[PDB]
Amino acid sequence: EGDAAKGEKEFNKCKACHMVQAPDGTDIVKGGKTGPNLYGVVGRKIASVEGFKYGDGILEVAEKNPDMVWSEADLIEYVTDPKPWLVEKTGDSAAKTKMTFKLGKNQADVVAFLAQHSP
Ligand code: HEC
Numbered sequence: 001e002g003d004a005a006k007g008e009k010e011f012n013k014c015k016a017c018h019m020v021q022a023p024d025g026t027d028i029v030k031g032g033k034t035g036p037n038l039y040g041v042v043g044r045k046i047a048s049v050e051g052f053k054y055g056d057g058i059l060e061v062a063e064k065n066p067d068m069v070w071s072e073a074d075l076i077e078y079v080t081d082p083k084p085w086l087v088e089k090t091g092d093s094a095a096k097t098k099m100t101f102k103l104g105k106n107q108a109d110v111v112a113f114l115a116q117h118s119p
Contacts, residue, residue: 001072007113010106014038017101020117028117035099042111042118045069057086057095064089075111079103 011020011029019031020039028039036049046062046069047054062068078085081102086095103110 002108002110002112002115004109004112004116006106007109007111007116010103010110011113013103014101014110017099020114022117038114040118041070042072042075042115043069044118055096055098057090057092057097060092060095061086061089072108072111072115075114076107079107079110 008029015029015031017032017034018036018038019033020028021030021037022028022039036052036054045067046065047058048062074085082097082099083095086097087093
């Protein structure tokens, strides 16, 4: 539904904290390590990157929904603002988020870009 080409450019806003790197080490987008690798994130189980120290809130969503993977819809909501997304799922207004960056536009496009590299 989104446009991956605009998504790729907008992802510049994410790359301070996230890379897109394939399992063989191929860099699609070089980025930081503060947040998890986002290669393959679309259709991935929520908070499931081994070795990453996730916050308590996103782990609670995964524990409550053990089979739940990132849908495009959920990704669009989460990247808009992680906090209300966690609050809705956990029912805890104090739910912890390690990510507070907000993307108020072009969300579907960034998600389309990520989907192109979630083969
Ligand atoms: C650092 C300041 C960040 C920026 C800028 C962006 N994100 Fe992020 N992200 C960050 C952290 C520390 C975490 C872990 C969250 C937690 O509470 O543990 C995340 C997480 C995500 C996820 C979920 C990944 C998973 O494996 O489940 C996604 C899908 C995600 N981030 C996407 C994303 C995008 C698209 C960004 C730019 C618009 C972006 N993040 C910015 C840290 C940081």
